[PDB]
Amino acid sequence: MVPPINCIFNFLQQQTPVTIWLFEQIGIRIKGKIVGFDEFMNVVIDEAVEIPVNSKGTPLGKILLKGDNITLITS
Amino acid sequence: IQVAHSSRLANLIDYKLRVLTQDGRVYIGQLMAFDKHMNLVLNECIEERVPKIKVEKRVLGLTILRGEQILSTVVEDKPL
């Protein structure tokens, strides 16, 4: 068994290709690699990229995204 | 419509209550149980939606209404 806290600790140490979907949001996705972790689901992401959905690679950098509006993570 | 000048919700329990909902429906019936989170248990709940003309109507009976999806409460009628 793996709780989300432990799977994100794998994503923390690895820093492998993450793709993030967003809460109350279908129009945009993110593509980066997990760098931080809070006690809440707040995670800072370096090498992040704004990726509009397959209904292109748009510009985005390193971001502290407020993690209460997360949907997906996959490193 | 008539009702006593009541202090709080629990004092007027088992009264026929028009209860609004955030999705547009209104649930009308005699309330059995309330909660800290405003979850309600209507004895003779009746599902009444407002479609885009005239009222939609349906009978449910004993049902739990979750509190989060409530708009407000209104007294429709007396007990018995």
Binding site: - | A33, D35, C45, G61, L62, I64, R66
Partner: protein, 82 residues
């Protein structure tokens, strides 16, 4: 403890209906319930908001999404109230 949530968990086993925030109704045997209404069903018909019925074996739901739950006429009788 929540006296409506009390009723829900007491209603386990009966053929109960369930509509969510999405407006998609359900109907079948209940299995599990908790403080946060983490509902499970069996033999559940799953009517979509349009009216498209899809029969399925089981389902699990989160409490935040739940709107209202149709309980039978048996819980009217006993024994939670008095």
């Amino acid at each position: 403890n929540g006296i409506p949530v009390k009723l829900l968990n007491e209603a386990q086993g009966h053929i109960v209906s369930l509509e969510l925030t999405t407006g998609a109704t359900y109907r079948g045997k209940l299995v599990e319930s908790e403080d946060s209404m983490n509902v499970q069903l069996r033999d559940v018909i799953a009517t979509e908001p349009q009216g498209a019925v899809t029969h399925m074996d089981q389902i699990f739901v989160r409490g935040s999404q739940i709107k209202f739950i149709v309980v039978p006429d048996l819980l009217k009788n006993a024994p939670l109230f008095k």
